[PDB]
Amino acid sequence: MEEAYLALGKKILEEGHFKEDRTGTGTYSLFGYQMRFDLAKGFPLLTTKRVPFGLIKSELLWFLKGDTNIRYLLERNNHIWDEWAFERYVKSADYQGPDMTDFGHRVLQDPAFAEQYKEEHQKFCDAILNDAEFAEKYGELGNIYGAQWRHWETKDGSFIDQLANVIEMIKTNPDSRRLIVSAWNPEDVPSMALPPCHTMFQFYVNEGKLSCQLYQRSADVFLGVPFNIASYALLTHLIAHETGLEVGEFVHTLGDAHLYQNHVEQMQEQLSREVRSFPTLVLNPDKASVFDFDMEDIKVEGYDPHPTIKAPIAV
Amino acid sequence: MEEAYLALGKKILEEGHFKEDRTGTGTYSLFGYQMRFDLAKGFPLLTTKRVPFGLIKSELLWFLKGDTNIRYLLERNNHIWDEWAFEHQKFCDAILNDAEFAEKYGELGNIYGAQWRHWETKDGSFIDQLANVIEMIKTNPDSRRLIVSAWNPEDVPSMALPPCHTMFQFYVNEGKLSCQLYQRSADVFLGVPFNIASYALLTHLIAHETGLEVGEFVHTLGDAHLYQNHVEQMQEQLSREVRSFPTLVLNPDKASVFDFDMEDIKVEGYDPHPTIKAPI
Ligand SMILES: CN(Cc1cnc2nc(N)nc(N)c2n1)c1ccc(C(=O)N[C@@H](CCC(=O)O)C(=O)O)cc1
């Protein structure tokens, strides 16, 4: 239930001790958490603030087609993966605009700098979208979620399609205890723009219902977790659709659940709002495979949330 | 709290879903569970039934030193894998006497020790996950990436018993080390008690190695299942009055944990109820 999520954010506000982090922003943090969402009770897209499903869709599709290049994402006007690509670009030999050291923090404090970042960011996206050589070198994120789900590279010159295998074990072996997809590949971690935040997931089956547990090593509570819940819920409806099954519980397990110190006013303002009905997910009955779904094949209807609460993304 | 485990077995008896596998094995089942153990309240060896700590020690020391060979376990009366290795005593004996014969037939290959200390790459090199996470702990305690993984999908479909312990994550706040463990499948009566002690000891060992106090051990389960002829044994356990967990005592005169042998790990104040027997 939404309440479960809202309770996480309260609990970190109350009890989460302060902890320095890679990004430099600062966080309040807990270790070890578990939220459950019965998906039969509604599609878990938060109603206490507007959460952009279109962006959740395209990021999922992007993960399922096995792709790790932002061009696809930018073609559908999704900029949620932009900064890590931009950061890679500005640290490269090829970049020659103004010094973008520390842009993640300096856009908040310095207005003529944010304008400069805004300019460079705009030429970066237009280069990715219109220069195939540039897209190819600088849209790339490494072997992040998509590469590991579809094309986990083997020792002897091949690849394992993890996701597709697990879908097929669900169909023929619904009681197996190894319905597991991992994105944590120790070989590829240092190559990755970021190691996987949602690290690994497991499926389970009882009386014709499909349930999923996610292990998430690092959980950005205000910005990310609303994405991840919806992302993994959508994935579960997709797999239940392909596999001919009803939809079960999504269980969200966390390692470091953190509230960025600059998300606190947002998380308090979110707590002051009454919970509304979850929406209903709608899928194309004509599509048969998880991997056949496109943007028009997935809608959410009945979504009537409270207003957008803006916050700054860490790094 | 030991009551977290006890509520878990009680919830399985009450709400667990029955299933029956190809061999004809019954189980009662739940998906998604989390138990926490505050290690400053005591070391979580079960008091409601006797749990054999020696076997947990020997087996954790064997994973920790990266050893995949039974000779170590055999020198310490631990027998839990001399089946996937096996006139019987002739073999056990020969492993224990002949210097070469142990290497020839006592190797077990790919399991926790090899995966924690020796994860093979494409170019033929090896990653020592555990060693690396220890230096990360000392040098970057605020890291959200203190992860060790036992799950390679290249090797799982090939292997005899794929790891029930799929990954663990460390965490540090205010001079205190915690560990969360994701376990994809769990024997609630015989395995889980065995696994709570193991991973709490691991946490204690890594805290000693890095000069930290112990925080929590968090146990997260996927498929948690009670075998149908553990029911009578689980019910018998829930009728017994919880006691205080005991105290772990680690030898303070050995600096590194990679030198710890059986004699250097002691449990004090351990007053469990009688051993409960069951099939495995
Ligand atoms: C890609 N992604 C997953 C991802 C990757 N690295 C991360 N790194 C950190 N520190 N925190 C995260 N949540 C995070 N998340 C993200 C990234 C940004 C937003 C985000 O800024 N969303 C805004 C803006 C949405 C919009 O474009 O309108 C929101 O209001 O929810 C969400 C998910």
CA distance B32 to chain A (A): 6
A211 and A250 in contact (C-beta within 8 Å)? yes
Nearest C-alpha neighbor of A170 from the set A200, A212, A216, A214:
A212
Distance, CA of B165 to CA of B115 (rounded, Å)? 11
CB contact under 8 A, A36 and B32: yes
The full 3-state SS of chain A, as one line of letters, equals CHHHHHHHHHHHHHHCEEECCCCCCCEEEEEEEEEEEEHHHCCCCCCCCCCCHHHHHHHHHHHHCCCCECHHHHHCCCCCCHHHHHHHHHCCCCCCCCCCCCHHHHHHHCHHHHHHHHHHHHHHHHHHHHCHHHHHHHCECCCCHHHHHHCEECCCCCEECHHHHHHHHHHHCCCCCCCEEECCCCCCHHHCCCCCCEEEEEEEEECCEEEEEEEEEEEECCCCHHHHHHHHHHHHHHHHHHHCCEEEEEEEEEEEEEEEHHHHHHHHHHHCCCCCCCCEEEECCCCCCHHHCCHHHEEEECCCCCCCCCCCCCC
CA end-to-end span of chain A: 30
One-letter amino acid at B225 equals: H
Distance, CA of B24 to CA of B18 (rounded, Å)? 12
Q: Ligand 1 mean position to A262 CA, how many Å?
A: 14
From the candidates A30, A34, A39, A178, which should be mutated to test the interface with B, based on the most B CB atoms within 10 A? A178
One-letter amino acid at A193 equals: A
Contact list, A251 vs chain B (CB under 8 Å): 31-32
Breaks in chain B after residues, C-to-N cutoff 2.5 Å: 86
Considering only the beta carbons, identify the residue of B129, B184, B222 that sits closest to A186: B129
Other CB atoms within a 10 A radius of the CB of residue B248 amount to: 22
Contacts of A265 (CB under 8 A, 6+ apart): none
Q: Ligand 1 mean position to A224 CA, how many Å?
A: 5
- What distances in angstroms separate CA B61 from CA A85, B31, B125, B132, one per listed residue? 43, 30, 24, 18
A71 and A140 in contact (C-beta within 8 Å)? no
Distance, CA of B206 to CA of B225 (rounded, Å)? 30
Distance, CA of A194 to CA of A148 (rounded, Å)? 13
Query: What radius of gyration, in Å, describes the C-alpha atoms of chain A?
Result: 20
Nearest C-alpha neighbor of B106 from the set B63, B60, B67:
B67
List, chain by chain if needed, residues with CB within 6 Å of any ligand 1 atom: A 23, 52, 80-81, 194, 197, 220, 223-224, 227, 313-314
CA distance A12 to chain B (A): 14
A250: closest chain B residue by CA:
B32
Distance, CA of B128 to CA of B66 (rounded, Å)? 9
Contacts of A218 (CB under 8 A, 6+ apart): A197, A255, A256, A258, B144, B145
B30 and B16 in contact (C-beta within 8 Å)? yes
From the candidates B165, B184, B217, B225, which should be mutated to test the interface with A, based on the most A CB atoms within 10 A? B184
Contact list, B21 vs chain A (CB under 8 Å): 175
Q: What sign for the dihedral angle of Cα A284, A285, A290, A292?
A: negative
Exposure letters A12-51 (e unless 16+ CB within 10 A, then b): beeebeebebeeebebbbbbbbbbebebeebbbbbbbbbb
Whose tokens are 């890095």? That residue is: B210
A120 and A98 in contact (C-beta within 8 Å)? yes
Considering only the beta carbons, identify the residue of A32, A178, A180 that sits closest to B218: A32
Whose tokens are 């509520």? That residue is: B7
Binding residues of B: 22, 144-145, 184-187, 195, 225-227
Nearest C-alpha neighbor of B76 from the set B96, B95, B90, B58:
B58
Query: What radius of gyration, in Å, describes the C-alpha atoms of chain B?
Result: 19
Per DSSP bridges, beta strands A159-160 and A180-182 are unpaired
Contacts of B190 (CB under 8 A, 6+ apart): B227, B230, B278, B280
Other CB atoms within a 10 A radius of the CB of residue A276 amount to: 15
Residue A255 forms contact with B (CB below 8 Å): yes
The full 3-state SS of chain B, as one line of letters, equals CHHHHHHHHHHHHHHCEEEECCCCCEEEEEEEEEEEEEHHHCCCCCCCCCCCHHHHHHHHHHHHCCCCEHHHHHCCCCCCCCCCCCCHHHHHHHHHHCCCHHHHHCECCCCHHHHHHCEECCCCCEECHHHHHHHHHHHCCCCCCCEEECCCCCCCCCCCCCCCEEEEEEEEECCEEEEEEEEEEEECCCHHHHHHHHHHHHHHHHHHHHCCEEEEEEEEEEEEEEECCCHHHHHHHHCCCCCCCCEEEECCCCCCHHHCCHHHEEEECCCCCCCCCCCC
Q: Give the long-range contacts of residues A173-179, CB within 8 A, separation 24 or more.
A: A174/A205, A174/A245, A175/A205, A175/B19, A175/B21, A177/B184, A177/B185, A177/B222, A177/B223, A178/B156, A178/B162, A178/B184, A178/B185, A179/A203, A179/A204
Per DSSP bridges, beta strands A27-38 and A152-153 are unpaired
CA distance B217 to chain A (A): 9
Per DSSP bridges, beta strands A246-260 and A209-220 are parallel
CB contact under 8 A, A186 and B127: yes
Contacts of B140 (CB under 8 A, 6+ apart): none
Distance, CA of A257 to CA of A217 (rounded, Å)? 8
- Ligand 1: nearest atom to the Cα of A49: 30
- The two structure tokens encoding residue A297: 């094949």
Nearest C-alpha neighbor of B144 from the set A42, A82, A27, A286:
A27
B12 and B226 in contact (C-beta within 8 Å)? yes
Nearest C-alpha neighbor of B62 from the set B247, B266, B256, B260:
B260
| Residues present in chain B in total | 280
Distance, CA of B187 to CA of B280 (rounded, Å)? 10
- The two structure tokens encoding residue B217: 């051990």
Q: Which of A227, A228, A267, A309 to mutate to test the pocket of ligand 1 (most atoms within 8 A of CB)?
A: A227
Beta bridge partners of A160: A152
A275 and A48 in contact (C-beta within 8 Å)? yes
Distance, CA of A195 to CA of A145 (rounded, Å)? 9
Contacts of A129 (CB under 8 A, 6+ apart): A71, A74, A75, A135
B134 and B210 in contact (C-beta within 8 Å)? yes
A254: closest chain B residue by CA:
B180
B186 and B223 in contact (C-beta within 8 Å)? yes
Measured CA angle at B233 (ends B228, B236), to 5 deg: 135
- What distances in angstroms separate CA B23 from CA A206, B19, B20, one per listed residue? 19, 12, 8
Contacts of B260 (CB under 8 A, 6+ apart): B61, B205, B250, B251, B254
Structural domains in chain B, CATH included, are: 1-280 (3.30.572.10)
Annotated catalytic residue, options A35, A100, A166, A197: A197
Distance, CA of B52 to CA of B59 (rounded, Å)? 12
One-letter amino acid at B86 equals: F
CA distance B23 to chain A (A): 13
CB contact under 8 A, A204 and B178: no
Nearest C-alpha neighbor of B82 from the set B59, B60, B100, B64:
B59
CB contact under 8 A, B31 and A200: no
CB contact under 8 A, B145 and A187: no
Considering only the beta carbons, identify the residue of B145, B149, B222 that sits closest to A202: B222
Distance, CA of A311 to CA of A80 (rounded, Å)? 13
Phi, psi for A32 (deg, rounded to 5): 100, 105
CB contact under 8 A, A17 and B129: no
- What distances in angstroms separate CA B67 from CA B72, B118, B124, B209, one per listed residue? 8, 10, 19, 19
Q: Ligand 1 mean position to A120 CA, how many Å?
A: 20
- What distances in angstroms separate CA B149 from CA B96, B164, B257, one per listed residue? 32, 11, 20
